Amino acid sequence: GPNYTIADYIRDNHIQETPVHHGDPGSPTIDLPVPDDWRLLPESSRAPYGGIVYTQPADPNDPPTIVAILSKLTGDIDPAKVLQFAPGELKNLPGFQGSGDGSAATLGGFSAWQLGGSYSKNGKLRTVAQKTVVIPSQGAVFVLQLNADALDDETMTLMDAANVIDEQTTITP
Numbered sequence: 809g810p811n812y813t814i815a816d817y818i819r820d821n822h823i824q825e826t827p828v829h830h831g832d833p834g835s836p837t838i839d840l841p842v843p844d845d846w847r848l849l850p851e852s853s854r855a856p857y858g859g860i861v862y863t864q865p866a867d868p869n870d871p872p873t874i875v876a877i878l879s880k881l882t883g884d885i886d887p888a889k890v891l892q893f894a895p896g897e898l899k900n901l902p903g904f905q906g907s908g909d910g911s912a913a914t915l916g917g918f919s920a921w922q923l924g925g926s927y928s929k930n931g932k933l934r935t936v937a938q939k940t941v942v943i944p945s946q947g948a949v950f951v952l953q954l955n956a957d958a959l960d961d962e963t964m965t966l967m968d969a970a971n972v973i974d975e976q977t978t979i980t981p
């Protein structure tokens with residue numbers, strides 16, 4: 809879309825991006841909680857750094873989910889620029905409408921950005937949110953993204969899970 813994204817920032821600079829998996833040497837330990845009535849998703853193509861799925865969806869083929877992605881950035885990387893461009897991806901979604909560009913936050917003592925809103929997919933309104941955490945460590949900048957998605961009517965289910973994550977996540981470089 810017309811908004812500059814983290815993907816664009818990496819593509820446009822001398823920055824190498826590597827996917828990161830649980831237990832990789834050199835990687836931060838990220839302890840994300842599993843809220844009650846949610847279930848852990850192992851790492852997979854659909855949930856690169858794992859995720860959680862709600863166990864009482866109104867539609868079993870479209871349940872509330874929060875998926876994690878962890879990337880390792882090396883090279884000519886500025887951590888504050890990653891936060892500056894975090895809004896771009898959601899803002900390019902079809903029909904996205906949110907409260908501004910989001911806001912600054914923290915997770916586990918590291919700087920983060922969070923934004924949320926609604927978008928229309930296949931004529932259905934969905935709630936989406938993304939928290940991006942920048943974790944400078946060991947000659948690199950790790951970027952954690954937490955991607956939340958649910959049908960509009962289950963917005964409050966997503967919000968509850970996000971509270972648990974914000975309260976209880978630890979990050980250890």
Ligand SMILES: CCCCCCCCCC(=O)OC[C@H]1O[C@H](O[C@H]2O[C@H](CO)[C@@H](O)[C@H](O)[C@H]2O)[C@H](O)[C@@H](O)[C@@H]1O
Nearest residue numbers: 905906907924925926937938939954956966967970973
């Ligand atoms: C930790 C995992 C990533 C963060 C998960 C946060 C999940 C909770 C749901 C999310 O925060 O959505 C709520 C935010 O979206 C809102 O959107 C509502 O209000 C806008 C106002 O323009 C409206 O257009 C939209 O249709 C509504 O759903 C707000 O934009 C945010 O400020 C809320 O916090």
